[PDB]
Amino acid sequence: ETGASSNASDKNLIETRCVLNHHSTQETAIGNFFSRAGLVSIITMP
């Protein structure tokens, strides 16, 4: 009800191991999300 999202993590709910992950966050940046050519118009001269 406070409008805040949950702050519970993996380590506080279950017993976890150590994971060193190197998954990049580059592709979900909005520059990479939008820099793709898409169709905006089709113009015809009959």
Residues forming the site for other proteins (CB under 8 A): 1-6, 8-10, 12-21, 23-25, 27-28, 32-33, 36
Partner whose footprint covers residue 30, from other proteins, its own copies, none (CB < 5 to 8 Å by kind): none
Residue 38 binds to its own copies (criterion: CB under 8 A): yes
How far are the Cα atoms of 15, 21, 22, 23, 33 from residue 10, in angstroms, in the given order?
A: 8, 15, 18, 18, 29
Residue 14 binds to its own copies (criterion: CB under 8 A): no
CB of 32 to other proteins, least distance (A): 7
* Angstrom distance (rounded) from CA 36 to CA 46: 30
